Design a protein around this ligand. Structure first.
Ligand SMILES: NC[C@@H]1O[C@H](O[C@H]2[C@@H](O)[C@H](O[C@@H]3[C@@H](O)[C@H](N)C[C@H](N)[C@H]3O[C@H]3O[C@H](CO)[C@@H](O)[C@H](O)[C@H]3N)O[C@@H]2CO)[C@H](N)[C@@H](O)[C@@H]1O
Ligand SMILES: [K+]
Ligand SMILES: [K+]
Ligand SMILES: [K+]
Ligand SMILES: [K+]
Ligand SMILES: [K+]
Ligand SMILES: [K+]
Ligand SMILES: [K+]
Ligand SMILES: [K+]
Ligand SMILES: [K+]
Ligand SMILES: [K+]
Ligand SMILES: [K+]
Ligand SMILES: [K+]
Ligand SMILES: [Mg+2]
Ligand SMILES: [Mg+2]
Ligand SMILES: [Mg+2]
Ligand SMILES: [Mg+2]
Ligand SMILES: [Mg+2]
Ligand SMILES: [Mg+2]
Ligand SMILES: [Mg+2]
Ligand SMILES: [Mg+2]
Ligand SMILES: [Mg+2]
Ligand SMILES: [Mg+2]
Ligand SMILES: [Mg+2]
Ligand SMILES: [Mg+2]
Ligand SMILES: [Mg+2]
Ligand SMILES: [Mg+2]
Ligand SMILES: [Mg+2]
Ligand SMILES: [Mg+2]
Ligand SMILES: [Mg+2]
Ligand SMILES: [Mg+2]
Ligand SMILES: [Mg+2]
Ligand SMILES: [Mg+2]
Ligand SMILES: [Mg+2]
Ligand SMILES: [Mg+2]
Ligand SMILES: [Mg+2]
Ligand SMILES: [Mg+2]
Ligand SMILES: [Mg+2]
Ligand SMILES: [Mg+2]
Ligand SMILES: [Mg+2]
Ligand SMILES: [Mg+2]
Ligand SMILES: [Mg+2]
Ligand SMILES: [Mg+2]
Ligand SMILES: [Mg+2]
Ligand SMILES: [Mg+2]
Ligand SMILES: [Mg+2]
Ligand SMILES: [Mg+2]
Ligand SMILES: [Mg+2]
Ligand SMILES: [Mg+2]
Ligand SMILES: [Mg+2]
Ligand SMILES: [Mg+2]
Ligand SMILES: [Mg+2]
Ligand SMILES: [Mg+2]
Ligand SMILES: [Mg+2]
Ligand SMILES: [Mg+2]
Ligand SMILES: [Mg+2]
Ligand SMILES: [Mg+2]
Ligand SMILES: [Mg+2]
Ligand SMILES: [Mg+2]
Ligand SMILES: [Mg+2]
Ligand SMILES: [Mg+2]
Ligand SMILES: [Mg+2]
Ligand SMILES: [Mg+2]
Ligand SMILES: [Mg+2]
Ligand SMILES: [Mg+2]
Ligand SMILES: [Mg+2]
Ligand SMILES: [Mg+2]
Ligand SMILES: [Mg+2]
Ligand SMILES: [Mg+2]
Ligand SMILES: [Mg+2]
Ligand code: NA
Ligand code: NA
Ligand code: NA
Ligand code: NA
Ligand code: NA
Length: 152
RNA sequence: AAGUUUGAAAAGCACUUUGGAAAGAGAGUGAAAUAGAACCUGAAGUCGUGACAAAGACAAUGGAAGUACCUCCAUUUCAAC
RNA sequence: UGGAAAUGGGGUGCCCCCACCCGUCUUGAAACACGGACCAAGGAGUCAAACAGACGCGCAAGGGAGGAGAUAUGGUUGCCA
RNA sequence: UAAGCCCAAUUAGUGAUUGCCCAUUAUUCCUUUGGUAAGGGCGGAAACAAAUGGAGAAAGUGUAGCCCUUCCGAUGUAGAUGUGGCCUGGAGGUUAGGACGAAGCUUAUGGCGUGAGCCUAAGAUGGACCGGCCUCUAGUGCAGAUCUUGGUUGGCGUAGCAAAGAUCUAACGGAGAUAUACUCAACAUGCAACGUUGGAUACUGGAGCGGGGAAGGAUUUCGUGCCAACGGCACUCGUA
RNA sequence: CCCAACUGCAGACCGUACUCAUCACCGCAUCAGGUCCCCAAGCAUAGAAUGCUCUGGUACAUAGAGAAAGGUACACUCAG
RNA sequence: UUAAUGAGAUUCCCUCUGUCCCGAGUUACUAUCUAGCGAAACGACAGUCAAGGGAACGGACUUGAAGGGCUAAGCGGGGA
RNA sequence: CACUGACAGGGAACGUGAGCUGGGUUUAGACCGUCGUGAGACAGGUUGGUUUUACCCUACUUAGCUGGAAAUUGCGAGAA
RNA sequence: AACGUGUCGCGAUGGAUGACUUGGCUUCCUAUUUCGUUGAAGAACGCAGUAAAGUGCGAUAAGUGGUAUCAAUUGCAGAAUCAUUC
């Protein structure tokens, strides 16, 4: 799962990624995309406020027949959610990215996220049992997440 | 059902750092690591991403003519030629 | 002699005018007739025998085997079934 | 005072007998293709180096068609036939390519062909085979048979995961926290969910989620470790 | 040789864990179905009806928030 | 023909009632919102109408009338 | 039969079953009559007999967000 | 605006294609070539320092003996001899 884009200045950037996360791809897709252009500290604050349920993750693409909320108005939407499993996974990834920036000698307070990509990982198979003795797939959809941030 | 068909050789990634771990970020080996492990080549379909093109509602696609903008394409020409 | 000027090609959009969904059975399909979500790989006039005609070739009042022998080979992994 | 109906005109009692607009039709011009095609040329006329008029000319069904001139036809289901027509695997010949990169794969890479297709360019693709031509040969060309196998996919984070009533609390255990740029005292920025023990509340109500056996199962029994996958939520727990 | 009361020595083989079920068996599964036997307490009551209870067992079966319409219910009521 | 018997078929009467006049209120579990998890059916392409013709009952065609885009909960007219 | 001003006739796939209901009609059980040698038959009678799926698109019902006069552009300039 | 659409670059998912072939299929040939109560074929259970399957073997159990060969086996470990036979 290589990085699809390269940073403008490599020495002033930090990279982080995770493969086969075992989080729902669609929920993680929405969670990671909202921080694409944000400063690292602002992204961390938003995730904490999502866990506190004072702010929400806007669901822009995979939002078919989900509920509506007022907390999505700040993103220009009406449908949003609070996917805590995706959120805590993304916060761990941000911590790894911050550690990489610290290791390279950069200041995390000045790091701005520049690239966020979420991909559909290989699917894990389970089965569910249906009426009239039918067996039917019960699939798990993990995701690949990659990001990098650069000093502003 | 299923070719373990990585590489010439395991030389199968020491060591540093973050992480409970998985792994990530570095660093190394190798001609090649996008050859990293049941790993040669890696198509189609589908999806993510950045850049750009725009676009009401005539479902979309299509035909014929132009035009706007773009073009890592081709060819020609550059002096009384 | 330039990141050049031209002409052609390619790409995307837009105008005006055209333009019913493929395959199929059927007198008649755009059909309120049936098969029709996408892609990859696979998927259907073949082999043998009898006869006939057309055309090519050899010979011709004659044509031709076939089976089997013979030895170059009573040799050679094989070429040489 | 038709843009209706009937009749009649073509710029109007002026001097003459074509108002205007639309075809895959007609005439004509250019190009292609095929003919029951029609003809001409094919005994190299002579002469001609570079520095500074050219090129070709094949006795021919079919090709980049030997060349030139001329005339006519050209749509079409089922179907027939033809094609120096296209393409695929293999064989007999011939001629080439490849570590300075073969096959395969990719394309806003163009060029050529009416077309099947062929060829070049680029790969910041690949890493060892392979192209053209004549002949031979066959398991030789896919869009669809409720076709076969494999993979994918919208529906979709949707339907739902609602019988068997019900859980609460503290401490301990655990990576599973009380996890924060600046500002800022804590609330308004780390949520949720756990295993054990003690309390609390309730359930099973002896025809029992009690204690033992047969059939069936065969290590599920016990202890320690362990959380990748599995127990359709979760687990630090487990018949994993 | 036969007995009695002793005594001395020797008493082989296989089975034996666990389960027997709203999770250990069958039903594709830890499936509200199916599956033979034994032991069976207190009170009310005619009682193996039904309700509650000491012993033993259990809170395991996705949960949280929470008065939309419409539903399901081994949930009710309604003037004349 | 027939006493007794019957989850058998039929008619009337008493009692009774939300069967109805004619609907209303309440409860548990759903739906609804959230966390975790997560399908299938179906899927030519698609999806606003009127008339006209048409394989005589069009979402595509002719001529008109509509049509800014994207969404949540419902609903059963159509999608022969 | 009764009330009433009046109790008019019709259409909408003989409107309307993923709206219900299932009495009838039209399976398999069974009885009778008639018919048939028989198996069986009868727009003759009788009794008993599983009514499945919407979460898709439109339509309708409500419920949110939000561009836009060159109806996204032109800078393309029109004031009830 | 936002969903959504289209194109290009780069990634993911997915294992087609090519190259590779200790396999299959098919056609020939050779011969002191045809099992077993002297217990066969088949079935079962065991055997290694380390050993589930498979293979080999049978309490002499990944083998004993003999002949030839002529310095190994090999993931680790073990091992007199480094060798005319012993
Ligand atoms: N760009 C648009 C799309 O390109 C596609 O094709 C693209 C790719 O299949 C193709 O392959 C590219 C290659 O060009 C490029 N030079 C290198 C790249 N590695 C390749 O990409 C390939 O490898 C990478 C990983 O290495 C994968 O992530 C990726 O999925 C795979 N397609 O490059 C093509 C772009 O020209 C499709 N043909 C088509 O759907 C569409 O036109
Ligand atoms: K001609
Ligand atoms: K010729
Ligand atoms: K076809
Ligand atoms: K989907
Ligand atoms: K035990
Ligand atoms: K699991
Ligand atoms: K009540
Ligand atoms: K009785
Ligand atoms: K129209
Ligand atoms: K009806
Ligand atoms: K019967
Ligand atoms: K009944
Ligand atoms: Mg819903
Ligand atoms: Mg919703
Ligand atoms: Mg089920
Ligand atoms: Mg079953
Ligand atoms: Mg590569
Ligand atoms: Mg622009
Ligand atoms: Mg154009
Ligand atoms: Mg017909
Ligand atoms: Mg016909
Ligand atoms: Mg048709
Ligand atoms: Mg019709
Ligand atoms: Mg038909
Ligand atoms: Mg048919
Ligand atoms: Mg005149
Ligand atoms: Mg023709
Ligand atoms: Mg072949
Ligand atoms: Mg393309
Ligand atoms: Mg074939
Ligand atoms: Mg195909
Ligand atoms: Mg739901
Ligand atoms: Mg629920
Ligand atoms: Mg319940
Ligand atoms: Mg349910
Ligand atoms: Mg805090
Ligand atoms: Mg907490
Ligand atoms: Mg009780
Ligand atoms: Mg019991
Ligand atoms: Mg145990
Ligand atoms: Mg689970
Ligand atoms: Mg015992
Ligand atoms: Mg026991
Ligand atoms: Mg028991
Ligand atoms: Mg059970
Ligand atoms: Mg079975
Ligand atoms: Mg008493
Ligand atoms: Mg009882
Ligand atoms: Mg009792
Ligand atoms: Mg249970
Ligand atoms: Mg349940
Ligand atoms: Mg009453
Ligand atoms: Mg009875
Ligand atoms: Mg259909
Ligand atoms: Mg209509
Ligand atoms: Mg239709
Ligand atoms: Mg309907
Ligand atoms: Mg009628
Ligand atoms: Mg009707
Ligand atoms: Mg019905
Ligand atoms: Mg209906
Ligand atoms: Mg009935
Ligand atoms: Mg009846
Ligand atoms: Mg009848
Ligand atoms: Mg404007
Ligand atoms: Mg303006
Ligand atoms: Mg073994
Ligand atoms: Mg012995
Ligand atoms: Mg020796
Ligand atoms: Na692809
Ligand atoms: Na793309
Ligand atoms: Na013409
Ligand atoms: Na002609
Ligand atoms: Na009509």
């Amino acid at each position: 799962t290589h990085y699809s884009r390269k940073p403008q200045v490599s020495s002033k950037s930090a990279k982080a990624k995770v493969s086969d996360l075992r989080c729902h791809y669609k929920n993680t897709f929405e969670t990671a995309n909202v921080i694409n252009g944000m400063p690292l500290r602002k992204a961390q604050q938003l995730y904490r406020q999502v866990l506190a349920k004072t702010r929400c993750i806007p669901f822009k693409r995979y939002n078919g027949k989900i509920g509506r909320t007022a907390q999505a108005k700040e993103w220009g939407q009406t449908k949003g959610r609070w996917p805590r499993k995706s959120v805590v996974a993304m916060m761990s990834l941000l911590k790894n990215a911050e550690a990489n920036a610290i290791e390279k000698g950069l200041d995390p307070n000045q790091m701005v996220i520049k690239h966020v990509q979420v991909d559909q990982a290989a699917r894990m198979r389970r089965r569910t049992y249906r009426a009239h003795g039918r067996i039917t797939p019960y699939m798990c959809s993990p995701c690949h997440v990659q990001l990098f941030m650069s000093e502003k």
